């Protein structure tokens with residue numbers, strides 16, 4: 037362990053002791069032009085402070101709004117996080133047509 041600093045990698049964000057010993061890692065990719073897709077998101081269950089995932093997603097959303105990027109997630113985990121945080125449903129394509137859930 038060292039510090040919970042947001043480490044940047046190959047189009048990804050992670051926090052941990054080392055690249056391999058990452059506590060929380062979130063990856064994204066540019067599918068078209070300004071749309072970033074989040075498919076992989078893994079956090080250590082045997083940690084305790086699982087709130088790190090919130091900061092990781094927040095950092096992506098915050099930066100997305102700055103460059104007017106569009107957020108899309110194939111990751112069932114990250115997607116649900118965006119569903120929870122209505123505040124992130126501005127850059128995230130959560131507004132398709134039906135909304136809510138049903």
Ligand SMILES: CC(=O)SCCNC(=O)CCNC(=O)[C@H](O)C(C)(C)COP(=O)(O)OP(=O)(O)OC[C@H]1O[C@@H](n2cnc3c(N)ncnc32)[C@H](O)[C@@H]1OP(=O)(O)O
Pocket residue numbers: 075076077078079080081086087089090111112113114116117120
């Ligand atoms: C679909 C994916 O990419 S996840 C599977 C791939 N991941 C890997 O390679 C490693 C596997 N390990 C993991 O990913 C971990 O077990 C995790 C990330 C799934 C566990 O999640 P946590 O780090 O505990 O996140 P945690 O739930 O505590 O907090 C973030 C949000 O996740 C949401 N969440 C919890 N469970 C789920 C779930 N089963 N599916 C979607 N979202 C969930 C919660 O709403 C939570 O929000 P809250 O803090 O307001 O309550």
